[PDB]
Design a protein around this ligand. Structure first.
Ligand code: NQY
Length: 128
């Protein structure tokens, strides 16, 4: 019952590594953008986001529900749109990363909703 968070985060990590990181040519979004290859990236993108640091956030148990998890996932696509443009080949790839994530989230919807409530009802019964 305290593994409710450990289970939720384990599922989130596998979604990232087994489904999102499996999108064809998604390798530029696997890791923080190398400043050596695009120098001005951190001068135009103020909230940079990638899959590797989503996984580091998962390992720190930052996401207690899929809402905050999706906030950082959608941030990858928002940053590609702001940097690469809406019609970019990179942006279309990031859109498919976001697509396969929403896909497998509704795939596990009934299961995750259980974990999400058991995590939060434990959060409130612990501070109460
Ligand atoms: C070849 O490319 C890269 C290589 C490497 C690299 O470490 N490779 C070397 C490793 C050592 N080895 C000895 C030699 C190879 C890193 C980044 C590249 N490019 C890239 C990454 C991410 C984005 C990106 N590019 N782009 C492209 C346009 C800017 C924005 C857009 C974008 O959103 N994103 C997230």
């Amino acid at each position: 019952d305290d593994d409710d968070q450990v289970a939720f985060s384990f599922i989130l990590d596998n979604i990232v590594t087994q489904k999102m990181m499996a999108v064809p040519d998604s390798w530029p979004f696997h890791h923080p953008v190398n400043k050596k290859f695009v120098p001005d990236y951190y001068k135009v993108i103020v909230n940079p986001m990638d899959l590797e640091t989503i996984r580091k956030n998962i390992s720190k148990h930052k996401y207690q529900s899929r809402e905050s998890f999706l906030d950082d996932v959608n941030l990858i696509l928002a940053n590609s749109v702001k940097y690469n443009g809406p019609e970019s080949q990179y942006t279309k790839t990031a859109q498919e990363i976001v697509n396969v994530c929403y896909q497998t989230l509704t795939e596990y919807d009934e299961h995750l909703t259980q974990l999400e409530k058991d995590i939060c009802t434990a959060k409130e019964a612990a501070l109460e």
